[PDB]
Design a protein around this nucleic acid. Sequence first.
RNA 1: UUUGGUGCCCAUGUCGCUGUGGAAACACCUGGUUCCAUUUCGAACCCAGCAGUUAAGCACAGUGGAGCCGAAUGUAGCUGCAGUGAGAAUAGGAAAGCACCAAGC
RNA 2: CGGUCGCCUCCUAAAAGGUAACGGAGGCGUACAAAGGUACCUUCAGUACGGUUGGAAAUCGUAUGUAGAGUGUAAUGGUGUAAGGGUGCUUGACUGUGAGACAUACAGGUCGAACAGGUGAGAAAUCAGGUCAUAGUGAUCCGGUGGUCCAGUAUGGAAUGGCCAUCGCUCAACGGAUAAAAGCUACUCCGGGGAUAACAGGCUGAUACUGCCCAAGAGUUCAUAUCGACGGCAGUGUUUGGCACCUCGAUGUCGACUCAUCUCAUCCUCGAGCUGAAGCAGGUUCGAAGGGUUCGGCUGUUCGCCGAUUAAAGAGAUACGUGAGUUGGGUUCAAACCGUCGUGAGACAGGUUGGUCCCUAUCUAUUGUGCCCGUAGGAAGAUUGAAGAGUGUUGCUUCUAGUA
RNA 3: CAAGGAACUCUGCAAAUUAACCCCGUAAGUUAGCGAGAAGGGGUGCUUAUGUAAAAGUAAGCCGCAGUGAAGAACGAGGGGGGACUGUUUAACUAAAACACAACUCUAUGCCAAACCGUAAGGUGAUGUAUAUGGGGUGACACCUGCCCAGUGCUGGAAGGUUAAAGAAGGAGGUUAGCGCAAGCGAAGCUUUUAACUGAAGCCCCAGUGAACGGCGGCCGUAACUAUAACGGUCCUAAGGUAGCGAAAUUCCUAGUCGGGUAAAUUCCGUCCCGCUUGAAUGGUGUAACCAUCUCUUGACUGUCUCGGCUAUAGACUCGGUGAAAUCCAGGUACGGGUGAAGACACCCGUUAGGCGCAACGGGACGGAAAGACCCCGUGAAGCUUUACUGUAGCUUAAUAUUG
RNA 4: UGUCAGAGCACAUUAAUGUGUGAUGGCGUGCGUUUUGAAGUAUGAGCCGGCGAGUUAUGAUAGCAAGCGUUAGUUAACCAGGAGAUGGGGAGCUGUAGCGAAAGCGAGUUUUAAAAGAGCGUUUGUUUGUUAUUAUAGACCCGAAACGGGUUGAGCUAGUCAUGAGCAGGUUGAAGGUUGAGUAACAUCAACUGGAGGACCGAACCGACUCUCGUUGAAACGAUAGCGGAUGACUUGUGAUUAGGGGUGAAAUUCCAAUCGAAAUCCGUGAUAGCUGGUUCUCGUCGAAAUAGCUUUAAGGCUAGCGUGAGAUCACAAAUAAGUGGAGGUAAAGCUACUGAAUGUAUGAUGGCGCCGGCGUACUGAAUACAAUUAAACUCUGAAUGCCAUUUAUUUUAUUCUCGCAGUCAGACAGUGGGGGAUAAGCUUCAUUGUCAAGAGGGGAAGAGCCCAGAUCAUUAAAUAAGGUCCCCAAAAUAUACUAAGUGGAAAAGGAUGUGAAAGUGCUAAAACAGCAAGGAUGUUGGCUUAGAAGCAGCCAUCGUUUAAAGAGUGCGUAACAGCUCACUUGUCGAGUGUUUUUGCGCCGAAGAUGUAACGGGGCUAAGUAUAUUACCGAAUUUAUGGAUAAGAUUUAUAUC
RNA 5: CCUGAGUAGCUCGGAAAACGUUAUUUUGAGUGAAUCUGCCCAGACCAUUGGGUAAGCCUAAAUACUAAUUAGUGACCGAUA
Lengths: 86, 182
Amino acid sequence: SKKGVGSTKNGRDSHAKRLGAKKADGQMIRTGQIIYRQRGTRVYPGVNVGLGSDDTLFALSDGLVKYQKFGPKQGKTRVSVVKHKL
Amino acid sequence: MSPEKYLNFFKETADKKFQWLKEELSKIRTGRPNPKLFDNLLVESYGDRMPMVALAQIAVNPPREIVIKPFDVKNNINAIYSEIQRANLGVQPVIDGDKIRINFPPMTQESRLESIKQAKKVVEQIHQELRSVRRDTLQMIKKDDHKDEDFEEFLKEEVEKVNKQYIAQLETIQKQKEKELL
RNA sequence: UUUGGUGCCCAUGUCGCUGUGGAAACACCUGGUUCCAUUUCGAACCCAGCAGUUAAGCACAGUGGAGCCGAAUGUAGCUGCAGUGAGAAUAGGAAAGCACCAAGC
RNA sequence: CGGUCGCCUCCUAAAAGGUAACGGAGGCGUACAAAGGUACCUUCAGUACGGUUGGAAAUCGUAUGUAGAGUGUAAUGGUGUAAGGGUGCUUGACUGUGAGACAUACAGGUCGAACAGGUGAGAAAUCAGGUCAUAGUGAUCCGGUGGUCCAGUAUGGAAUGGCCAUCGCUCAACGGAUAAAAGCUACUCCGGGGAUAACAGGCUGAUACUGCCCAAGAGUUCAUAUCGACGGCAGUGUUUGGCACCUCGAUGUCGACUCAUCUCAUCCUCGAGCUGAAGCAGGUUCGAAGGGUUCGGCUGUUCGCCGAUUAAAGAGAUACGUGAGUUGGGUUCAAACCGUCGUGAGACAGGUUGGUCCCUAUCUAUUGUGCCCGUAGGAAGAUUGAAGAGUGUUGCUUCUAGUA
RNA sequence: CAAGGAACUCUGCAAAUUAACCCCGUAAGUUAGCGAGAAGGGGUGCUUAUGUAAAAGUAAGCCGCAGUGAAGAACGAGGGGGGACUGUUUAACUAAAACACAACUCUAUGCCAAACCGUAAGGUGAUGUAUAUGGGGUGACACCUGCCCAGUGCUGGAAGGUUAAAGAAGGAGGUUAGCGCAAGCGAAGCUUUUAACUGAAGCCCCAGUGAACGGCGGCCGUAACUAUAACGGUCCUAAGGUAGCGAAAUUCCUAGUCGGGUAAAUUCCGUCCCGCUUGAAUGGUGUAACCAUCUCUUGACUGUCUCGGCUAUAGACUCGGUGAAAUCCAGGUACGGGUGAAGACACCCGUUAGGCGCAACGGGACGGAAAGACCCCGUGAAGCUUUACUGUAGCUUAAUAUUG
RNA sequence: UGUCAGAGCACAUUAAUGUGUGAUGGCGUGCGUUUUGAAGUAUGAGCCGGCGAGUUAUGAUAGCAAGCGUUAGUUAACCAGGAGAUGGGGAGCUGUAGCGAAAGCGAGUUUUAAAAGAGCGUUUGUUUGUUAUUAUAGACCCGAAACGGGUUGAGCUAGUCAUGAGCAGGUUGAAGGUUGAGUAACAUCAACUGGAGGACCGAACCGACUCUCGUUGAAACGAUAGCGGAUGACUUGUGAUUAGGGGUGAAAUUCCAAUCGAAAUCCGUGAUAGCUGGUUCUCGUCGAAAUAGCUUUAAGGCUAGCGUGAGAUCACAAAUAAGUGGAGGUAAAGCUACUGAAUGUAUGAUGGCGCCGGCGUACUGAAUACAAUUAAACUCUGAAUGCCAUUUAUUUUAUUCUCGCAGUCAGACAGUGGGGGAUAAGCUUCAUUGUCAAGAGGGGAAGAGCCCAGAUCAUUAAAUAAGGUCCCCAAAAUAUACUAAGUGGAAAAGGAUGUGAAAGUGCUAAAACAGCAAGGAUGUUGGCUUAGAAGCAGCCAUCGUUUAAAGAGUGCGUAACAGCUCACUUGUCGAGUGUUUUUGCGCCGAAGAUGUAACGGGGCUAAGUAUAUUACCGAAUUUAUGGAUAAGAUUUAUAUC
RNA sequence: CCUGAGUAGCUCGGAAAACGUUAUUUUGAGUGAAUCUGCCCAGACCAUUGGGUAAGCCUAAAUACUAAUUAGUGACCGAUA
């Protein structure tokens, strides 16, 4: 019935950090604004994209965000800053 | 050891103890159909100690007799036939060709009484020693798990039920000995 | 439009196999005499030149060999029993392509 | 009692992000003048081929190998001339900042263009405000250390106070109540809970019991005369359970005596069929609930064991039925001892001795008996039977006949 | 109340059985006092006489069914367990296996005694005087009290280290008179600071004290197997329970085995000794007698029972008088199934019931009193214990004034 | 326990379709309470009458109004008077410059070398009146066990002291000594003195161990029947005696006035109560949450989010549809594209071994090829949906901000995807989609979470939704088949010439199946072997011969045999003859105890089921009319939307 | 010549001070000055400066309060208050 408990050996995790992207396609953004959170490079930096020491990807100029495919079989993803009408 | 490993060690020791107990209870006087009653008693072949399985074969054609089959009928059957008589049997044996066929009429009520008494006392000694080993295992367990009471109690009844199962097996074998005694 | 370098894409592009070719070249090739260089050494590199070659890199042709890629059906998966729409398998192509400059042509 | 309280990594988490779990998997309470940076140079592991000791494995030469190598590390990944190795040079492993974003209740934590000055790396453009990244850390009160263009109780100083920097504090229950605090109370009590108890009751049927099928085989043979694994299907609620529920401003129980009832998965009495059913004694499967199915010793013990007896001494349910029908023997108040444990109050899911069971019946149901009316003018007898209820136990001996 | 006679039952609870007087006889044990009314039998009347101060007793006759004719009169024996006993015990649950108890043992106290109380005089102790008082424990009598000072507590010891308040050997600094170009040095007053050294008691240190807390083992080889343990080696400890007893108030297994008991006895009696967790004054074994002590057996004994019934009352019922209580949202207050916050007089479905009573007896209205009291929680309370914390009574030590 | 009605009866009023009353029809399981929630077997309430629980003093904040108003307002205190405003009274304060720790500076300050860059500054208000909130005050009402202080109780028990009393009666006969006998003397024996004995029986008395009765008692511990003591450890009277972090205590946590882990009394104290309980006029409008984080924390409390009210923003904001764009790595699918696992087969590595570097390796099996695979933490790939931003169109002043007041964290249910548990549980944990909570109604047999659906009120008006149409009970029939189970209106695996339909499948009037007749042999008793199996114990091959036909024998049956019988082939007669598969409805499997008890019932072979038709009924839904009114707008006629 | 000696004071524990011991004040214990040339204080203290010279005492006035008397009042309660 009511037996002993303890040593479940599992059921532990950490605080789920808000990781992923930080911009939406179609948004007019400015320089110094963060676009993506990740480890390593699952999303590759395009033009005017800077890297913050926590493997953060942010914008370097003012313009629109767009996505592109590259790689031998186009399985890799780039994010490019296509500037607005200027 | 773990509590389950404690049970495993206790079960190994109890299996050895049961081999011992079966060995003693076999030799104890019954209606005497036990193949191991004769097996644990060595025979004086030409003045030397010999076993039976390594020398002959055992069988039971009727359910009141025993049959001994040796290889040699001129040199080996006599060495076992002489020691079959004048023993705890108390019956006159005969030889039918290459096999000794020994009948076992039921024991008298008095000799059966001492035989049952001594068998029960042997089982009692085995019981006391098994419980002593169980208490030793419980001492190692109280050196082992001294934390959650509900778990230590679970270990207590685990050991208790293992002991009860082995007691049941030993008692069933005792009942078998008593029934073949009839 | 041929050659060399090089620009975008970053194997439908590739790897490999059978040949041709270099006049100008690009290349091998001849030396460490000079600045420089080797965890060492003219191997690389930098100085300076073409005696010899299309060999190889290189380019063009053929080769679909390996690998890459891949026509349609439907269901699979799903969204209020109709739509949504696969993957896989298959025919199969692809022997890369878009350019710029300098000369030869 | 266990384990945890803080923080990070994967699934869970259902393709934005994110989402709980006492769910499934691991760690941190860091390391480094290189493992930061700069400029330059360089490219796998593994496998294969051939070689002194020397091989499976020491290494080299080459090919091949898409990087499964390696990245200070837990996991996530990425990392194919890179985020990795080698060389040289400094330690931007800057000062004051900072527009602006992130994430979020606060506190905070994350990145940060770009500016002024100064540098470092490289001739250089450019890079450098720590490491490819995420854990890697404790506020505040108080206290100490150095400096300060701060004040100096009338003044002058000084002491002392103030600002910046710095250090102490597993406040690890890690957002932390003081600088500083263990247990027992069956001597206990107060307020609360069916949201958190034991029982009952209720859901589920894992388990327990029962039924069934498949039939290898055992059974001279022949699965199913009698069984039957290896395996499953189910059912019952009935044993053990899971449940945290209408009920805890109260549903009193274990047992013993009394009242029994209903049901069948029938024990006997009733009937039928098959046989590994010569007879007898049977086994077997079903219909089958009318009646009945013992006494004594021990245990508080229901139960259970033993002896004797009938044809048998069946099984469940009704709040482990039955105190607004009796008792408390045990059980579960203090009281006391024995053995053990805690040093100590005490405790034992140990034994041991005794140790308080309330009720003037309101209503319904329920067993008897009356009052008024009805039964159609009033009165008195006799009825049919509408409807049910009681009741439906059974042994022995003899004859047929020692006959078949 | 015919018979049985503990068979009912946790158990002879209860009840019955026994009684008063006289005459026989009365055992084991015995510590000589008891046991003893032991165990068991006979008679108790009327009249006459023998009889004595009075009787008692005896002889003859007299019968009743029976003659302390009525009255009130211990039932007894054996076994086991505990306690010595007579006794005190929770007023109002528990009368004891508890406590007390004489006795035994240990300890302290030399007088203005220790001790206890009070702030303190002072007082009991005690107006006592170590054969007295106080405490600790064991609790007739007899025989013993085995080992261990590891740790603790106490006593004794002083070297060694360690030790306050306080005293001052001494150091540093400020203010500024003055000296100084500045810087700075710096007399005297006050200023501020604790360090040489002294600083007790005490702690660490060393021995004894266990009838002071208390505790008082394993591994391997070897005994006509052998798990056992007679034995021999090893490890650990301060020593490893010696004696004695040993399913006991202790033993889980266990209802252990054995014999008796019992037709049949989880209880009982003795025994078996590896004894979960026995054990020697937190005492152990025999132990005479005794217990409103507990348990088992036994002769008798009985309506406890087998198996219940009758006689009289007080009620219960009626009549006359008087006459309250708990409960109480309101009701005209049926049945079965389902449903529900999971147990429906009110719900839905079908069934039946003229209305109102009285007498029993109480299924139900989860009947009544008792805002849970069983269990849990509350940053609840209270008491109790303590190496929980902090204080503190008391005791003890040093300094200083008394005090030369 | 009444409503909507209503026969009839008797009346006649605030004269009005009136009142009273109801034979009878339809309908209908209280109020607060707290919970996710009660007709509730959850609690309280017998009823009635009064009474009965958010005030005040001060201060601050917020709203509205006012006075003054850009150095004004305003007085604290104090004084004159009616207990009065008022006047006299500027004591001070707020707003009129902030920055910096402060010095100090200042339309700039601080950080800083720097006003670089950043912070704030770069300027409005004062005081009263109303309401609300907050703060100090006990501060809505009530409920604790509790602590200390100041006092009273020893008359009850206990304890001792001094004074006394008391033990009816009858017993037994100890120790001690005298005498005599005995003994060396003792010891001992008998009589006597003697009457001791925590001695006996047994009055009174003391205490209350046990049976029964009693249990709102006659009794706040009794009645009666038994019991012990009843010469001392004896009971009692009188007076004093010891009092509550205290006494007393043959000790039990005993007693201390029927009550005591420490009495009662008064006060601090109205202690505290995250826990219970309650909290008294009307109406209108809007109108959530049971989630997250933190917490000496899980019942509580703080912040968010949310609702509401005032203002502004008022379309760049927010949604609703249409479209574009991105990510994912979910599902699926695959896993010589990995990760782990794992199987069938081939050459077969390493090879053990055998073997004179080969020879067989009949075993392990590299890699490869083979066809399949399992994965939430497997992914070469790889969806959809959804989410975000974005464009077009509608709507809103708002899902934007601030301000004031909040409220909730104990949710539950149903569906989806799950996890745990067992893809057991009306169970737990989650996310999502709806409901109740917080909102009723119809269907659902009655039912909080299911379906249809969102209720101003009156209707004796219409269209309907879900759903239903034999009757109860408003509401339909036709035709096609199936059904004989009452399936409908519990069931599982398995089984079945049930049955209907569909699809194909051989013969055939030269006569198909069937019914029945005839043969059915043979080497041959084939052999292994059973003393005894040879067509049939067990095993092995299981053929040819003649025949239309024939099996070392289809079985039965035998110790063997034998025999019977069939497949096989023929025959009599002559119209149907088989499984091959898939679907509708069926049957069994299906035994438990208040009463049928797994359609609501009566009943139903249609009134059952599926199939097409036109119908109908039917909701607080929608529409209609009438009444009031809220928010808004033309506008003040008091009209409309 | 004098002006208030166990006095001010220093130390060990204190308390009051808003102050939880800090200027200042007081003492249970120890210690203990100068004589207005002096001292106290000016929140440690020191110097200058300022002020007053403790170590004796008294003091109507505004001050709280009603137990009551006298007269009067109550945007006080009306026999459950």
